[PDB]
Design a protein around this ligand. Sequence first.
Ligand SMILES: CCCCCCCCCCC(CCCCCCCCCC)(CO[C@@H]1O[C@H](CO)[C@@H](O[C@H]2O[C@H](CO)[C@@H](O)[C@H](O)[C@H]2O)[C@H](O)[C@H]1O)CO[C@@H]1O[C@H](CO)[C@@H](O[C@H]2O[C@H](CO)[C@@H](O)[C@H](O)[C@H]2O)[C@H](O)[C@H]1O
Ligand SMILES: CCCCCCCCCCC(CCCCCCCCCC)(CO[C@@H]1O[C@H](CO)[C@@H](O[C@H]2O[C@H](CO)[C@@H](O)[C@H](O)[C@H]2O)[C@H](O)[C@H]1O)CO[C@@H]1O[C@H](CO)[C@@H](O[C@H]2O[C@H](CO)[C@@H](O)[C@H](O)[C@H]2O)[C@H](O)[C@H]1O
Ligand SMILES: CC(C)CCC[C@@H](C)[C@H]1CC[C@H]2[C@@H]3CC=C4C[C@@H](O)CC[C@]4(C)[C@H]3CC[C@]12C
Ligand SMILES: CC(C)CCC[C@@H](C)[C@H]1CC[C@H]2[C@@H]3CC=C4C[C@@H](O)CC[C@]4(C)[C@H]3CC[C@]12C
Ligand SMILES: CC(C)CCC[C@@H](C)[C@H]1CC[C@H]2[C@@H]3CC=C4C[C@@H](O)CC[C@]4(C)[C@H]3CC[C@]12C
Ligand SMILES: CC(C)CCC[C@@H](C)[C@H]1CC[C@H]2[C@@H]3CC=C4C[C@@H](O)CC[C@]4(C)[C@H]3CC[C@]12C
Ligand SMILES: CC(C)CCC[C@@H](C)[C@H]1CC[C@H]2[C@@H]3CC=C4C[C@@H](O)CC[C@]4(C)[C@H]3CC[C@]12C
Ligand SMILES: CC(C)CCC[C@@H](C)[C@H]1CC[C@H]2[C@@H]3CC=C4C[C@@H](O)CC[C@]4(C)[C@H]3CC[C@]12C
Ligand SMILES: CC(C)CCC[C@@H](C)[C@H]1CC[C@H]2[C@@H]3CC=C4C[C@@H](O)CC[C@]4(C)[C@H]3CC[C@]12C
Ligand SMILES: CC(C)CCC[C@@H](C)[C@H]1CC[C@H]2[C@@H]3CC=C4C[C@@H](O)CC[C@]4(C)[C@H]3CC[C@]12C
Ligand SMILES: CC(C)CCC[C@@H](C)[C@H]1CC[C@H]2[C@@H]3CC=C4C[C@@H](O)CC[C@]4(C)[C@H]3CC[C@]12C
Ligand SMILES: CC(C)CCC[C@@H](C)[C@H]1CC[C@H]2[C@@H]3CC=C4C[C@@H](O)CC[C@]4(C)[C@H]3CC[C@]12C
Ligand SMILES: CC(C)CCC[C@@H](C)[C@H]1CC[C@H]2[C@@H]3CC=C4C[C@@H](O)CC[C@]4(C)[C@H]3CC[C@]12C
Ligand SMILES: CC(C)CCC[C@@H](C)[C@H]1CC[C@H]2[C@@H]3CC=C4C[C@@H](O)CC[C@]4(C)[C@H]3CC[C@]12C
Lengths: 613, 613
Amino acid sequence: SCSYVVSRPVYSELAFQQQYERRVLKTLLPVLDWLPKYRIKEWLLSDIISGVSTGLVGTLQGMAYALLAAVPVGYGLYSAFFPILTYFIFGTSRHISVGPFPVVSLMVGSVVLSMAPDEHFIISIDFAARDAARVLIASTLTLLVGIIQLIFGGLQIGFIVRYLADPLVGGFTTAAAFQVLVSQLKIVLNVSTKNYNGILSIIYTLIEIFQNIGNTNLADFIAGLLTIIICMAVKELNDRFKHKIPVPIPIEVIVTIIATAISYAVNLEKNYNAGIVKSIPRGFLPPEIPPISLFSEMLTASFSIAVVAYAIAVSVGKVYAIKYDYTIDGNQEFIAFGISNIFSGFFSCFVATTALSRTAVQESTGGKTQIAGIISAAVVMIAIVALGKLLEPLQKSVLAAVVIANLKGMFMQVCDVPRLWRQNKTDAVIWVFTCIASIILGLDLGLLAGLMFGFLTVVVRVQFPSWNSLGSIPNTDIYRSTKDYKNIEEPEGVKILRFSSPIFYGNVDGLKKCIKSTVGFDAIRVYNKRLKALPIHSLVLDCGAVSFLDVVGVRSLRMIVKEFQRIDVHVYFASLQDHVIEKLEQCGFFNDSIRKDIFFLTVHDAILHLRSQ
Amino acid sequence: SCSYVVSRPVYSELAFQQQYERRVLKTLLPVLDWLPKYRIKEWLLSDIISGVSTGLVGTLQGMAYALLAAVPVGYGLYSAFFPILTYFIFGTSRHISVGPFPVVSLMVGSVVLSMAPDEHFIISIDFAARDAARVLIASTLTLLVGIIQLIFGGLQIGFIVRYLADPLVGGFTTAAAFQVLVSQLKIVLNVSTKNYNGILSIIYTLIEIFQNIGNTNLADFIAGLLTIIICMAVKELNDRFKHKIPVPIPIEVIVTIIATAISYAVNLEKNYNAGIVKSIPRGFLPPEIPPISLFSEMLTASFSIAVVAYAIAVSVGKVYAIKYDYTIDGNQEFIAFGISNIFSGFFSCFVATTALSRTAVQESTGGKTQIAGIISAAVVMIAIVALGKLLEPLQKSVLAAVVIANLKGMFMQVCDVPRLWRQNKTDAVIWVFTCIASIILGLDLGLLAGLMFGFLTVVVRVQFPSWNSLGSIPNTDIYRSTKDYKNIEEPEGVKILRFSSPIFYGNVDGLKKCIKSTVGFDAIRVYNKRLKALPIHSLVLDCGAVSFLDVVGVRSLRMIVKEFQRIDVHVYFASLQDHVIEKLEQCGFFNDSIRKDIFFLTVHDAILHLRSQ
Ligand SMILES: CCCCCCCCCCC(CCCCCCCCCC)(CO[C@@H]1O[C@H](CO)[C@@H](O[C@H]2O[C@H](CO)[C@@H](O)[C@H](O)[C@H]2O)[C@H](O)[C@H]1O)CO[C@@H]1O[C@H](CO)[C@@H](O[C@H]2O[C@H](CO)[C@@H](O)[C@H](O)[C@H]2O)[C@H](O)[C@H]1O
Ligand SMILES: CCCCCCCCCCC(CCCCCCCCCC)(CO[C@@H]1O[C@H](CO)[C@@H](O[C@H]2O[C@H](CO)[C@@H](O)[C@H](O)[C@H]2O)[C@H](O)[C@H]1O)CO[C@@H]1O[C@H](CO)[C@@H](O[C@H]2O[C@H](CO)[C@@H](O)[C@H](O)[C@H]2O)[C@H](O)[C@H]1O
Ligand SMILES: CC(C)CCC[C@@H](C)[C@H]1CC[C@H]2[C@@H]3CC=C4C[C@@H](O)CC[C@]4(C)[C@H]3CC[C@]12C
Ligand SMILES: CC(C)CCC[C@@H](C)[C@H]1CC[C@H]2[C@@H]3CC=C4C[C@@H](O)CC[C@]4(C)[C@H]3CC[C@]12C
Ligand SMILES: CC(C)CCC[C@@H](C)[C@H]1CC[C@H]2[C@@H]3CC=C4C[C@@H](O)CC[C@]4(C)[C@H]3CC[C@]12C
Ligand SMILES: CC(C)CCC[C@@H](C)[C@H]1CC[C@H]2[C@@H]3CC=C4C[C@@H](O)CC[C@]4(C)[C@H]3CC[C@]12C
Ligand SMILES: CC(C)CCC[C@@H](C)[C@H]1CC[C@H]2[C@@H]3CC=C4C[C@@H](O)CC[C@]4(C)[C@H]3CC[C@]12C
Ligand SMILES: CC(C)CCC[C@@H](C)[C@H]1CC[C@H]2[C@@H]3CC=C4C[C@@H](O)CC[C@]4(C)[C@H]3CC[C@]12C
Ligand SMILES: CC(C)CCC[C@@H](C)[C@H]1CC[C@H]2[C@@H]3CC=C4C[C@@H](O)CC[C@]4(C)[C@H]3CC[C@]12C
Ligand SMILES: CC(C)CCC[C@@H](C)[C@H]1CC[C@H]2[C@@H]3CC=C4C[C@@H](O)CC[C@]4(C)[C@H]3CC[C@]12C
Ligand SMILES: CC(C)CCC[C@@H](C)[C@H]1CC[C@H]2[C@@H]3CC=C4C[C@@H](O)CC[C@]4(C)[C@H]3CC[C@]12C
Ligand SMILES: CC(C)CCC[C@@H](C)[C@H]1CC[C@H]2[C@@H]3CC=C4C[C@@H](O)CC[C@]4(C)[C@H]3CC[C@]12C
Ligand SMILES: CC(C)CCC[C@@H](C)[C@H]1CC[C@H]2[C@@H]3CC=C4C[C@@H](O)CC[C@]4(C)[C@H]3CC[C@]12C
Ligand SMILES: CC(C)CCC[C@@H](C)[C@H]1CC[C@H]2[C@@H]3CC=C4C[C@@H](O)CC[C@]4(C)[C@H]3CC[C@]12C
């Protein structure tokens, strides 16, 4: 077959260089970008049906996720209404449904509970004033999140979601599922548990819940358990029996309607002392400027909430964009969601993002442009102004059970954890660390710790690389580790070391140790012994994988070269990239008799050059 | 001259694998490790003189650095005495002098001031009780630092000091010099400034100092200014006139003795209301168990103090070990200094490490084994029990001026900052970020921020690598970027991309973008266009610099290969390391018709194989 034949001079870097010479309508994305390009002829019907369906779903979803936040039921309607309208303008994706997404809602509610506890606020009981303070805190947090997202989009840093690795995303998702399960379990049991804010909070809440389980409201518990059973049964049947009925069954909406029907008919609120929403505001409240003085106590939480919400939004947007063959602007997504959160925070809402289930409902029933979003917002509006009284008898345990039923996919990742461990240990370590940190910490603090641990794992993987002592395959130019192939011959008096990493400070000490181990000695000690009195003659450093190089790395390389030259041992560098050589020359490496003549193109020119002497 | 001639088959990874088959008396370092091997015949005199000199220096240094900590003068004597005795046993280095090192002392004092403010403690004035509380807090912090150091040495993690990069070390050193200058400027002026704890504290202290400069004690200011002038003048003369008098002149000790002499003779304390130490305990106080309940409020500070103190200790130890041709055990250094800090915290001392100036004094005057340390400790002991009364009239402004005079070398690094910028921008960025963070934050918080900023810079450098579209140098096997050499020919219908970095999540998005830019299109869009209807035929990925690879990287590579195969474009990998191929095979890459036959040894076997078809 084909043969590898090449005849050329032995090029050093100096010789190679001698012979071959070197050397305005986007930030505010218009609705006019697609409204003139609309398809009113046929798209109107699909948009209307899709919007009605996703609005029916999203009213219930926002109502339920308002419990995840520490705000009274009714402000979830505002959170499902306002951001959709103000994302219809600046939004790039045309399939996602803007809403609470209970993970972000639970982060917001954790912040609100921390900044407005039951005992710290009410000393009389002042439900109304406490709810007002909680709403103000949620609005302030939403405004801060929107400001942060707008700043990030303006700075065009949309790649920060790359740092949200799949393992840490999965671990954070499982931990958030556990936290949401604990919160909604507190809600369904109708048990009055004091809120624990800080570290180990979830386990303290579980301890108090299992201590107060004797005070469980039987009616609420049965309602929640039946809602969960019905929802998961219908979801499993849809997953199995999927060839027919392509549109997923909106079981949650029907379950809520029926449960509200019985709650009104038999009046569980008075007869069985059930925990119902009991209050829904009618009409739209006037906008109120949040107190910016609280921004200092929300920074570490607003940052994490913004990052998580934007990551979820872009994830769903990309999932549907690759399906419908279009591209979403990440920085414009940041702009759209930052403006959305600012607008919603001004109008008394908590942080808004997209939800995979709501987006799936919107798309599967005739998914088209964001006009479906406007229709869903209109449905939420008529729910706010008209259907508010009808939803009063509905129990909160039903909403909490709906969220718990939806938690299955989030809980499912512990099954793929062991496969992650079998494939790559560090990825499973990142997963488990993110899960544990987000459990025994805040979800915001857990996310920050998971990101930080991902950075640390990258640094450690770069800092402790694979290094080999290379030898030549006979009659070829192929050099492999001598201990791996058993047909590898060690060259005469010359050791070849491959350090498969960029050289920085941690790598500097690692590389010094690796060279000392490979050559079998250290230049300092032998030089000192020879001075007091008064096996290897060449060391080739295979630097093909040396990506970057810092001042500490250049200083270490110079020190190694000088130390080995002091004992009449020549150090040669091979396979160094052009940019690394530029870094060496601009870091002052080529001073004091270096002259770039000890640099070769591959580790075969070095060996041939040594054989020439 | 020598020529590059090689004849061999074109080996893919599959073909290459087919043809070439693969496959108890240290933790407590005894004084008996060198005491039987001692040289009593001649080493005793050198050790005695060196110990006397360094003890005279270290008594004054500990006395001065006790002001850097928020503890009364006199406990610096204990901090200079006890750790030396308990490091004589477990210590590896035989040249360093154990003591306060005013940077660690200032970190301890910042912690102590934060945890025992003037207004929060005294509400009557209760100098005695406040001093007792400050001493207890310093002892608790020292015990926690010792526990952390002992744990780190037991875990054998002595490489954490590699993460203390030279740029961040220099920036932290300059910021610590600024903080120490501010503190000792507050002391010398004898101005009562309320202590600011937290962020922006140094600038608040400067503002208050310049506001209260009208209340400056003239006698203390003149004493401090004269002490500074004399110390720097003598140091400059020694640096210039250095051929004679090899032993550095101990100007600080003589200056302190003379200043105390005039303070006793003229009684500056009563006549001019000078700020004197005014109190030195006689004898040794009984040991007291620190309250461990304060450990929770010292963790972020104790960790940083332990890391900084250990880093300084090992830095000085290595500097003198490479000079005297011996090796110091890093983990045993951790053990020794952790036991030292535990012992000193039990005996009412603040955190102990080594000082470059004190170690230089000890070594230059007959530096020998740690017996000189024992002699210095004995000198400090006789200062504690006898010379305590003689040092009472000495002003604190003299000690603060001594520290300020020593701050010159620490302040000098702003001179090398611009050269760091010219050599490597990211290293200067690390330097400046560490300096600014340690200025507007705590020194401990500044150190943590600088460390993780170094981690972030490493992650970013790996995440945004140098990538090139390679082409062949004629009649050779040398492939270089087509836009850099101008003699490079693009091969027929095949693009070669070199991604000079390990492939992880941020890198997988970067690599997808790089491939899309290089090939001039994207597989997804062209495949979708062809499906709706119903330039490059090969892409070689030069993966020589791909160091590691995670599950996200393997998934991205599989997706790229599948997407390009969908549009009849073949993707080949070349120069991949053996361990990266093992990672690919254990991550499930070689499934669904991959078969490892698209992997070549270098980027010339791929081109020859393509030319074969
Ligand atoms: C883009 C990159 C990432 C950016 C991340 C930004 C993080 C910003 C943190 C901000 C911060 C540190 C600043 C320095 C940080 C140094 C870090 C060094 C790291 C080195 C590796 C500000 O610190 C000070 O905090 C004071 C309050 O303590 C605050 O208020 C004071 O002045 C007010 C008038 O101004 C006055 O009204 C007020 O009365 C005063 O008290 C001050 O204004 C503020 O300066 C800490 O505050 C954050 O908020 C909370 C505070 O309690 C705290 O909440 C947690 O509570 C749960 C437990 O209960 C916990 O479980 C939750 O998680 C979380 O809800 C957060 O944890 C904390 O973080
Ligand atoms: C190896 C790698 C590094 C390890 C670093 C380890 C750091 C550990 C920090 C410990 C920590 C957070 C724990 C969670 C951190 C999560 C981080 C996630 C990061 C994700 C990327 C504990 O948090 C809680 O703090 C409570 C006090 O607030 C403390 O006391 C409570 O219960 C007691 C009875 O138990 C009871 O007696 C007490 O009355 C209660 O109040 C609790 O016990 C304790 O759990 C925060 O505490 C640390 O100490 C100080 C507190 O004020 C604070 O001091 C700063 O003040 C200056 C301004 O004034 C500032 O300028 C200085 O710098 C610094 O002196 C520190 O800043 C803070 O850090
Ligand atoms: C579609 C589903 C979710 C509708 C749920 C309707 C709720 C309100 C219904 C369904 C089952 C009902 C329970 C069935 C049995 C009992 C026991 C009886 O001694 C008291 C009433 C009580 C406790 C009922 C309360 C109301 C209840 C919980
Ligand atoms: C009992 C209630 C009140 C609290 C616990 C939450 C309940 C409703 C939910 C939360 C997550 C759920 C689990 C999620 C995943 C699976 C795997 C599946 O193959 C069998 C069902 C099973 C095992 C579910 C059982 C029911 C479950 C445990
Ligand atoms: C509310 C509290 C109780 C939640 C606690 C969740 C913790 C304990 C759970 C959540 C996910 C779990 C992990 C999921 C999968 C695996 C792989 C298998 O080899 C068992 C261990 C391990 C690694 C589990 C360890 C325990 C774990 C980290
Ligand atoms: C070790 C390999 C063979 C396990 C293969 C099956 C995996 C996917 C299953 C089998 C049993 C499962 C565990 C069973 C029980 C628990 C406790 C709870 O905290 C959830 C996670 C955890 C820890 C599960 C994690 C996933 C698990 C380990
Ligand atoms: C096809 C293979 C992977 C199936 C393996 C069984 C799976 C479905 C089962 C085995 C054990 C189960 C876990 C057991 C315990 C808990 C704790 C609960 O609070 C949430 C559900 C969770 C986390 C379960 C999730 C589903 C689970 C992981
Ligand atoms: C990868 C890196 C950045 C992760 C860093 C996580 C560190 C800072 C976190 C993770 C878990 C945290 C601990 C969790 C619980 C407690 C108990 C509390 O009474 C004192 C604080 C203490 C002891 C915390 C100290 C800080 C801590 C150790
Ligand atoms: C070797 C050096 C450091 C010795 C320092 C000795 C100190 C105590 C001496 C040296 C110079 C002296 C000052 C010289 C001049 C004056 C002005 C006079 O109107 C009041 C006394 C006062 C303010 C003296 C106070 C004491 C003083 C500050
Ligand atoms: C005036 C006093 C009270 C407060 C300021 C500190 C004084 C004593 C010290 C601290 C650092 C010192 C500087 C450090 C470095 C240099 C560079 C040298 O080539 C000339 C002297 C000079 C410029 C020093 C002058 C004196 C100095 C500014
Ligand atoms: C107590 C307060 C005032 C201390 C403030 C210290 C800050 C402002 C100082 C300390 C060291 C300084 C840096 C040292 C060297 C250089 C290089 C030159 O190109 C000037 C800018 C730059 C980058 C300086 C910027 C300002 C700087 C960061
Ligand atoms: C820019 C190049 C040419 C400068 C070369 C000389 C360098 C070493 C010197 C010249 C002037 C110096 C600056 C002069 C003044 C200040 C203000 C103060 O905060 C100290 C740092 C800083 C910012 C100095 C940093 C170092 C500096 C920039
Ligand atoms: C040989 C070359 C590098 C000499 C350049 C001049 C050097 C010695 C001078 C120029 C400007 C000076 C700085 C000017 C201002 C300050 C602020 C002060 O609070 C500490 C000293 C410090 C930081 C000085 C240190 C010395 C300095 C950097
Ligand atoms: C590389 C990474 C780890 C560095 C992280 C540094 C971050 C967390 C630090 C650096 C400087 C800090 C800020 C410094 C000053 C203030 C003003 C205060 O009123 C509120 C907190 C706030 C706004 C801090 C927030 C946190 C902050 C932005």
